[PDB]
Design a protein around this ligand. Structure first.
Ligand SMILES: Cc1nnc(C(=O)NC(C)(C)c2nc(C(=O)NCc3ccc(F)cc3)c(O)c(=O)n2C)o1
Ligand SMILES: Cc1nnc(C(=O)NC(C)(C)c2nc(C(=O)NCc3ccc(F)cc3)c(O)c(=O)n2C)o1
Ligand SMILES: Cc1nnc(C(=O)NC(C)(C)c2nc(C(=O)NCc3ccc(F)cc3)c(O)c(=O)n2C)o1
Ligand SMILES: Cc1nnc(C(=O)NC(C)(C)c2nc(C(=O)NCc3ccc(F)cc3)c(O)c(=O)n2C)o1
Ligand SMILES: [Mn+2]
Ligand SMILES: [Mn+2]
Ligand SMILES: [Mn+2]
Ligand SMILES: [Mn+2]
Ligand SMILES: [Mn+2]
Ligand SMILES: [Mn+2]
Ligand SMILES: [Mn+2]
Ligand SMILES: [Mn+2]
Lengths: 183, 184, 183, 187
């Protein structure tokens, strides 16, 4: 599963995920499913930022924590938007709102409910993707046009097929359900 | 003809064509006309995908066949379009449809007829270009704007002229008319 | 402060600022605050030119003085616009006007009034940014859309935050105030 | 003048101009004014092709004559537009027409009328720039928006200024008026 992750995502995303996981004390060679999931979330965030006009999104995910909070503080002090309690994934300059991007192998309704109850702020926009082609956004406001989101969903289903053809899909799908049924 | 093919198309297209023809058991050095035709079809598909907005098209032609079918499956599952019986060339995320692209040295109406009768799927769009400047699309819906299609046609006619100035056009034009009579 | 400037701005801007300071007889190693100010103004000008269409702005700032005046004369002779008395920072081909860009650590309107009374031109547009998210432009015409200006403001606030975190913001803010009171 | 040309235009344009001058049996070291003129014309054609959107212009100038005529063949046979009798500079896929671009140190309308009487083509669009900022196009259809043409004119005036600052502008401007009067002499 580790060699698959290193062959499936580009080395920059792999390096960013390795750094983010070593920061939380987790191991790429052991917790390979979390490695894959973090790589997937990063690729989705980057494709999402690429979906709009050139200057539309400020990328928060993928940065170092302190610098990410610095950019969040700058955005809040210059636009007047409330500071989120948890680090978001993007900022939308066009719609003037923070975006929390989610990718799940689970039920999309349950994941959206979990994230919405975790955020509790009436500002941060939520947008969930899944490996089955479903997506759910705050107020059904999907931010991007249909082409960008469809590309993201196609990439996700391709990742799922690639995992299934080598027999890693079942364990990867049950890993996220294991972190929610245990933690 | 083989040296002409290697000089006329960029090395990435030539590499892709050689890999496809070795996948289908053919020889670039012997059947140089099909070498040229596959390079031409690949170039047309690429200009076509470049004709629209940034990421309007998913490119299926030019891939390993297994990965091509994987991408087709992903598209079909995330959008709901029916899975084609034959590998198409592009997928249009804007109009939500697969595109089969044809480049023919023969009469265009006949080529479109054979393509549409082989596809049978009432969803896969068909777009045919010729070496004379004539094009033909399903429902006269040409997908791209006039300028991109005109660039494609200009490039096709330039290929035809470069072939003819070397005495290679007659054999190339009869290569397709011969394999069409042999298949029957 | 010098190391912070060299690690905070990309080497092209740092080199242009070093050239601008050596041309005026100043030393970046000892006048580090003005080093930072020149780097910041250059970055803002370059972000501003990137704010519109690909070929909308002629960049006047960041050149050799003689070549910049040559380009100014060319613009004036081909468009008929009045030649400015001081080198501006940009030329807007869409609105057909020169642009003076300012970045101040004081109030935007004081700086605007000073610059306007200095240039004494009814044609040259003036656009002032601050390190606190405020902006002031001639006739309230901000040239660019909200997204590009918001990007610029966010970057300015991030620079201010980095300075503050290193304990250099106070001296940088009081340096501009100490230079104006000398006149 | 030759050093100025070599340091004023980017190396690709200098190479193209040298190739064209040798193709016409002329020495860029001796005929430095014509050297600069070819360089300026090529740069203007390239900025012009940039001025539009992505797939608008087929660039004809800058190619060798055989392939240029081959591309004009392809365009005429796939679009139905008329055969130009002389090699034009660009082809506009949006407006579906060939474009002849001229850059003159003389009066713009004099140059336009000379070119339009030479080519005598009903479809070939003509667009003339000068080193003073004047421009003139067929039916006042300038093809590009105002910003692109303004950039072109600004660059032309900058070239004029750089030439005059070096003492080369007077000879450059008298070069074109000396070649036009010579062409009007059958004797
Ligand atoms: C519901 C539900 N089910 N699983 C989760 C969940 O949160 N899982 C993790 C931790 C793996 C996660 N993390 C981040 C992230 O950015 N974390 C860094 C951070 C640090 C501090 C701070 F305040 C906020 C965020 C994501 O973006 C993200 O999509 N996920 C899934 O939520
Ligand atoms: C009518 C008519 N006249 N000639 C043909 C014709 O089909 N000729 C060939 C075979 C040379 C061809 N092939 C493909 C292609 O992609 N094939 C690979 C594939 C593999 C598996 C699968 F299920 C379907 C297709 C093209 O795209 C293409 O344009 N052509 C012309 O049709
Ligand atoms: C009010 C108020 N408070 N401080 C200033 C102020 O002007 N500060 C300086 C001198 C540091 C400054 N300079 C230039 C510039 O271009 N200088 C070089 C130049 C000037 C004139 C000319 F004709 C040719 C070249 C800027 O662009 C710029 O933004 N600033 C801030 O204004
Ligand atoms: C009137 C009037 N006043 N000066 C001229 C003029 O034509 N000057 C030259 C020759 C320097 C010129 N040449 C080409 C060009 O492409 N030449 C290639 C070619 C040669 C022979 C042939 F029959 C057709 C084309 C240009 O594009 C161009 O802009 N110019 C200015 O016209
Ligand atoms: Mn996150
Ligand atoms: Mn997230
Ligand atoms: Mn195909
Ligand atoms: Mn095809
Ligand atoms: Mn300036
Ligand atoms: Mn300024
Ligand atoms: Mn020409
Ligand atoms: Mn010309």
């Amino acid at each position: 599963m580790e060699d698959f992750v290193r062959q499936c995502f580009n080395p920059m995303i792999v390096e960013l995920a390795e750094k983010a996981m070593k920061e939380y004390g987790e191991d790429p060679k052991i917790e390979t499913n979390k490695f894959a999931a973090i790589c997937t979330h990063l690729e989705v965030c980057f494709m999402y930022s690429d979906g709009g006009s050139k200057h539309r999104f400020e990328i928060i995910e993928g940065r170092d924590r302190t610098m990410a909070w610095t950019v969040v503080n700058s955005i809040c002090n210059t636009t007047g938007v409330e500071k989120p309690k948890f680090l978001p994934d993007l900022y939308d300059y066009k719609e003037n709102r923070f975006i929390e991007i989610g990718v799940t192998r689970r039920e999309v309704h349950t994941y959206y409910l979990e994230k919405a109850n975790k955020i509790k702020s009436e500002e941060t926009h939520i947008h969930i993707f899944s490996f089955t082609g479903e997506e759910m956004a705050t107020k059904a406001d999907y931010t991007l046009d249909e082409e960008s989101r469809a590309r993201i969903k196609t990439r996700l289903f391709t990742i799922r097929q690639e995992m299934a053809s080598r027999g890693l899909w079942d364990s990867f799908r049950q890993s996220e359900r294991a972190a929610a049924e245990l933690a």
